[PDB]
């Protein structure tokens, strides 16, 4: 059950200790490197193009509506515990990307195939058993969080606000999905490179617009979050179920800390060493949770700090849009627009995430089948009725989660050694 979350975060504590809080110091340099200009040394696409691919998958309706679900059910304190998920999770994502170096490229052009299923093959053979299990899960798990959750949330949200959107929204999402992923990952890096920054800058500025117009409410909004999350007034650590569990569960969803579904994109980077790309990847969480999600969480609390009628019982995606429209003139239109790109981003990335784990099982023979399935399932997800889709998604992600976490624990020695190589290269 949810013991895996105690396991998942436990690695985050563990690796951060073993890696001595590496994330706080390396973060600026990795940020400089990730967005640095001008490198071509054995890779499918740029470091930047890999990050935008990973961020496209990492940024999803969980950033828009998954936080809202956590804010209502777990209280505003869930945001802080979402942060702890990312901060300690930074090390987890890094360890994922480092170990992705034990990757062998596939046939049908370079394409290259790196991921946790490969680590397990290069573990201490059981790893063959774990890797085939991981691919078995991840190949399925991609449809939930990567396809069905994101494709349904937009479809319903668009139908509420604009209402000329039965299957029509499903159709255009399928066409635009097929066009990009037709040309494989090389095509994906093109689209995710342009889409993601335009998406993120669009959303984040509006939040800073909201904060600018209501400056005074900022610090108390921080206060209620910090006052919550550490509110033991009720129950002996009974906020574990309230704020911590919802903060972690939803937080892991948005930033995808240790699900092992991150470095799959990191492998395609043109990297000299694992450490080069693994630092740019570790920035995936920071942009998702600390930047995007925190932007989303701040607006939600501010509306709660205000009075505002009728938002008291709003489900999730509608809550943030209503919370935005409350504070900003066209906030509702902004959020629903972002939701379209936010989900579309996650469809493409998670397609590659699911592909490569699928091909591990079947080879490149069925890659065409996976792509066409993903496009078809994307169409169905908008039309079909998936009320509790998040719940089954979290199970698949947890099913995906169990093996990779074991690997990161066992292969902690490899990465820490492999790190002591790259950081030595960083003095020259």
């Amino acid at each position: 059950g949810p013991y895996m979350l105690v396991l998942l975060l436990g690695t985050g504590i563990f690796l951060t200790l073993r890696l001595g809080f590496m994330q706080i110091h390396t973060l600026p340099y990795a940020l400089k490197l990730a967005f640095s200009k001008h490198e071509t040394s054995e890779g499918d696409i740029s470091h930047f193009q890999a990050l935008m691919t990973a961020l496209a998958a990492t940024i999803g309706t969980g950033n828009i509506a998954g936080v809202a679900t956590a804010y209502v059910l777990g209280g505003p304190g869930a945001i802080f515990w979402m942060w702890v998920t990312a901060f300690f999770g930074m090390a987890t994502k890094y360890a994922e990307a480092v170990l992705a170096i034990k990757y062998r490229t596939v046939d049908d052009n370079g394409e290259m195939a790196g991921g946790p299923m490969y680590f397990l093959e290069k573990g201490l053979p059981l790893g063959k058993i774990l890797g085939v299990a991981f691919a078995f899960f991840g190949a399925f798990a991609a449809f939930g969080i990567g396809n069905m959750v994101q494709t349904n949330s937009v479809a319903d949200a668009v139908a509420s606000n604009f209402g000329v959107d039965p299957l029509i929204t499903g159709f255009v999402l399928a066409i635009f999905t097929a066009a990009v992923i037709l040309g494989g990952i090389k095509s994906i890096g093109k689209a995710t490179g342009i889409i993601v920054p335009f998406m993120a800058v669009f959303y984040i500025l509006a939040g800073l617009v909201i904060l600018a117009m209501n400056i005074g409410y900022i610090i108390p909004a921080f206060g209620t979050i910090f006052s919550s999350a550490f509110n033991f007034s009720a129950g002996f650590g009974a906020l574990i179920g309230t704020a911590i569990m919802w903060g972690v569960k939803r937080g892991v969803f948005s930033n995808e800390a240790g699900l092992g579904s991150a470095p799959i994109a990191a492998a395609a980077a043109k990297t000299d060493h694992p450490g080069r790309q693994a630092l740019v990847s570790m920035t995936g969480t920071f942009l998702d949770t600390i930047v995007v999600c925190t932007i989303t969480g701040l607006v939600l609390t501010i509306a709660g700090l205000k009075a505002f009628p009728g938002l008291t019982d709003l489900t999730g995606a509608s809550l943030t849009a209503a919370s935005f429209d409350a504070l900003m003139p066209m906030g509702g239109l902004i959020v629903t627009i972002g939701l379209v790109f936010f989900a579309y981003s996650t469809v493409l990335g998670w397609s590659y995430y699911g592909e490569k784990c699928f091909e591990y099982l079947i080879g490149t023979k069925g890659i065409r089948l996976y792509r066409i399935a993903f496009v078809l399932v994307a169409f169905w997800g908008a039309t079909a009725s998936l009320p509790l889709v998040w719940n089954i998604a979290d199970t698949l992600n947890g099913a995906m989660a169990i093996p990779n976490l074991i690997g990161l624990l066992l292969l902690s020695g490899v990465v820490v050694s492999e790190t002591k190589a790259f950081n030595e290269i960083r003095k020259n």
């Epitope: 209502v72 319903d156 949200a157 009720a234 569990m245 019982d313």
Partner: antibody, heavy 114, light 108 residues
Framework: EVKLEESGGGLVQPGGSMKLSCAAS????????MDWVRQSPEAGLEWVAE??????HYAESVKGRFTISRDDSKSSVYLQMNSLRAEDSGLYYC?????????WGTGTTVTVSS | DIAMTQSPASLSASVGETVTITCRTS??????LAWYQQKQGKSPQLLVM???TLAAGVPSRFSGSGSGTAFSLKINSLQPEDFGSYSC?????????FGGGTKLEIKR
């Protein structure tokens, strides 16, 4: 303030069909997910159906015999019941859902008997 | 299915005293428990949301507490206007269930 008025209740023979209505006003039917809750003549209070604007969920007791629909243009929610049973007798209440059922309807009465 | 059992099934309270009502359920549900009050010819009225949080416009005498596997609804200094049936509901999932109900009556 907020308005929820149910309608369409009546007397229907077992195996029959009818659809209820819940004209809503005072807020945005489109943004909120809506529920149908029914109370038996013995104060049962049983949940029936869920809907948001696209997808729906049903209780196992009625799965396949109830159809919940919505019309955000006409700001009304529907519940279509067919192949009715005697146990379907109760007061059918309209309401909007999230975690607690705060804003409730008037209630309309269904009697299934020969 | 989650089964929530309420006790006592019915009680009579001498006016002006304090009473405590219990809703107990099969499995742990965190803080996702809500309380209502229903009167003759009326829909249920929300009293306490999410175990302890307080609804607006409902008098302060009503208080609810508990988490997990023990819930209690507490009324301080009852009044004859509190005569009715008190029901509990949980938000575990989307098929929210309800209790059998507790009938509150008045002593004279």
């Amino acid at each position: 303030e907020v308005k929820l008025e149910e309608s369409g209740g009546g007397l229907v023979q077992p195996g029959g069909s009818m659809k209820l209505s819940c004209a809503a006003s005072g807020f945005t039917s489109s943004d909120f997910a809506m529920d149908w809750v029914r109370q038996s003549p013995e104060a049962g209070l049983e949940w029936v159906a869920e809907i948001a604007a696209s997808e729906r969920h049903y209780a196992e007791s009625v799965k396949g015999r109830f159809t919940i629909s919505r019309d955000d243009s006409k700001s009304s929610v529907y519940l279509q019941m067919n192949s009715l049973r005697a146990e379907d007798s109760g007061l059918y209440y309209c309401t909007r859902t999230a975690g607690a059922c705060g804003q409730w309807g008037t209630g309309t009465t269904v009697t299934v008997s020969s | 299915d989650i089964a929530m059992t309420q006790s006592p099934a019915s009680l009579s309270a001498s006016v002006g005293e304090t009473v405590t009502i219990t809703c107990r359920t099969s499995e742990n549900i965190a803080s996702a428990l809500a309380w209502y009050q229903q009167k003759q010819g009326k829909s249920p009225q929300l009293l306490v949301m999410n175990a302890k949080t307080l609804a607006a416009g409902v008098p302060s005498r009503f208080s609810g507490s508990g988490s997990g596997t023990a819930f209690s609804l507490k009324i301080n200094s009852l009044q004859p206007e509190d005569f009715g049936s008190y029901s509990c509901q949980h938000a575990a999932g989307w098929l929210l269930t309800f209790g059998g109900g507790t009938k509150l009556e008045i002593k004279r």
